[PDB]
Amino acid sequence: KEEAQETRAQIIEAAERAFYKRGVARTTLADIAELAGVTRGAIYWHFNNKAELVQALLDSLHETHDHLARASESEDEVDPLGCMRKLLLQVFNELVLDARTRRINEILHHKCEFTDDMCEIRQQRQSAVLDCHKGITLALANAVRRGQLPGELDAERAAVAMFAYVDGLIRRWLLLPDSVDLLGDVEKWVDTGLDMLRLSPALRK
Amino acid sequence: TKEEAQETRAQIIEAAERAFYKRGVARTTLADIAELAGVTRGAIYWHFNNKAELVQALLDSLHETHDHLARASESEDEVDPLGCMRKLLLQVFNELVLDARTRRINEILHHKCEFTDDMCEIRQQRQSAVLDCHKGITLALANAVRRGQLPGELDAERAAVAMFAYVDGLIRRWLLLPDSVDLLGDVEKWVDTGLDMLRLSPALRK
Ligand SMILES: O=C(CCc1ccc(O)cc1)c1c(O)cc(O)cc1O
Ligand SMILES: O=C(CCc1ccc(O)cc1)c1c(O)cc(O)cc1O
Ligand SMILES: O=C(CCc1ccc(O)cc1)c1c(O)cc(O)cc1O
């Protein structure tokens, strides 16, 4: 029943503390098993290796925005740019309010080396950023098919400029919090990025 | 100063870069840097005390090819403080794609260098560096406003952060997926885009 299947969520949670205190590079399954109070067998039962766990920390970040995201990417949503505003606000709200989001992000950006002894962390990350880029592009097009964003704007590049700016901000708040009142000014910070996409001639063809 | 220790100093740094690049900054002992560099261990000890001193010196190295433009841009008597900043950003990107040395230290710094509350000096240094860099963009952005090169009521402080986030994230995306961003081919567009956001965006005002 309810045992074997709930251990999974207890393994992930211990994997987070372990990763947070020690770092991905130097943590081993064994470290996580002791923390979870299970055996390395219980772990191997849900996770073939340490890259799956990491992967699972990463795939957990998408859940809260899922719907707002899917909306932005829908060709039938009359407010696609407005949907991308609500998502960015939620990404930044979730970041400031949820200890758990803050720490998975803090693990991904500042613990977590790409080493060649375990290169699926890197491959997993590349691939994750491609799929997020493709999402942004469609949203970008959808707003353009709609008078919300300048016609024949460069999707691709705007997509990358947008990612760059948000990744870099998140990582910056993650380094210096008291230096960005990210919560008190979510609106300003989001629209700065929005203003770029819609006002930058360099982002045009 | 002494001519032997210089080459000696130079020979440890260079091999730290090679060493963090393969093994990363968490699982690399100053002893690895030994057998790789050649130099006897205790000298690596005369030279640097731990990891935070050495990692620090990789960062310190990065800044240098950009000294002149960055302090030009920051000078209050500089007639074109946005001009310098434009070129600076060009050099930075140009140097990233070209100089194998620069692309590597950046990879180390972004991708191979964990923060643990056990390796506090790595984080502490990082924080400090960004605050310094931050202190520069703001002065320059303030000199460009004054010159009437950036909108009048520009929020310099928020603006520097905005700019800072966009470049750091662009560098990292390029490291992560170079074949995605023709950083070298479209280099002018990438700079201008970030500059456009400083000048055009309403939200960065006041
Ligand atoms: O722009 C973003 C998210 C930006 C972002 C990427 C990574 C991250 O860590 C935080 C925020 C975005 C999507 O992703 C999906 C969408 O349908 C619309 C949309 O606007
Ligand atoms: O996967 C990432 C981080 C991407 C990234 C990792 C390393 C790097 O160097 C640059 C970018 C991520 C989040 O964290 C949060 C999101 O809502 C979406 C999202 O895609
Ligand atoms: O924007 C930057 C550097 C950004 C940056 C460079 C290298 C790097 O590795 C990461 C970020 C900058 C300064 O710092 C100081 C200035 O007076 C002007 C200026 O334009």
Side-chain angles (χ1 to χ4, degrees), chain A residues 134-151:
Chain A
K134 162 163 282 288
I136 303 169
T137 317
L138 289 194
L140 286 198
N142 294 336
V144 186
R145 267 180 201 122
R146 285 230 193 284
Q148 326 214 233
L149 285 179

Side-chain angles (χ1 to χ4, degrees), chain A residues 61-62 65 91 105 108-109 114 125 128-129 132 163 167 171, chain B residues 111 172 176:
Chain A
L61 292 182
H62 317 152
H65 316 308
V91 165
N105 278 101
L108 286 231
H109 299 192
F114 300 150
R125 198 71 124 276
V129 181
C132 173
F163 196 85
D167 185 72
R171 182 176 51 238
Chain B
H111 289 336
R172 205 158 161 156
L176 183 73

Side-chain angles (χ1 to χ4, degrees), chain B residues 79-121:
Chain B
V79 198
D80 194 8
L82 189 62
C84 304
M85 186 156 77
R86 196 163 147 65
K87 263 191 67 167
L88 185 139
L89 276 178
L90 258 317
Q91 191 162 75
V92 161
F93 296 137
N94 275 303
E95 178 172 56
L96 228 196
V97 195
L98 300 178
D99 180 17
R101 182 94 56 155
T102 318
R103 192 213 322 119
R104 272 207 209 91
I105 287 163
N106 275 88
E107 172 80 3
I108 286 166
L109 254 131
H110 284 263
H111 289 336
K112 289 150 185 318
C113 192
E114 305 196 330
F115 300 147
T116 55
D117 64 53
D118 160 78
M119 289 308 302
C120 209
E121 224 153 14

Side-chain angles (χ1 to χ4, degrees), chain B residues 179-200:
Chain B
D179 271 304
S180 274
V181 173
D182 181 3
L183 192 55
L184 185 58
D186 303 292
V187 76
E188 291 194 72
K189 289 173 185 173
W190 289 115
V191 172
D192 283 329
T193 299
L195 288 175
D196 281 350
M197 176 188 55
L198 295 172
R199 63 181 180 88
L200 299 177

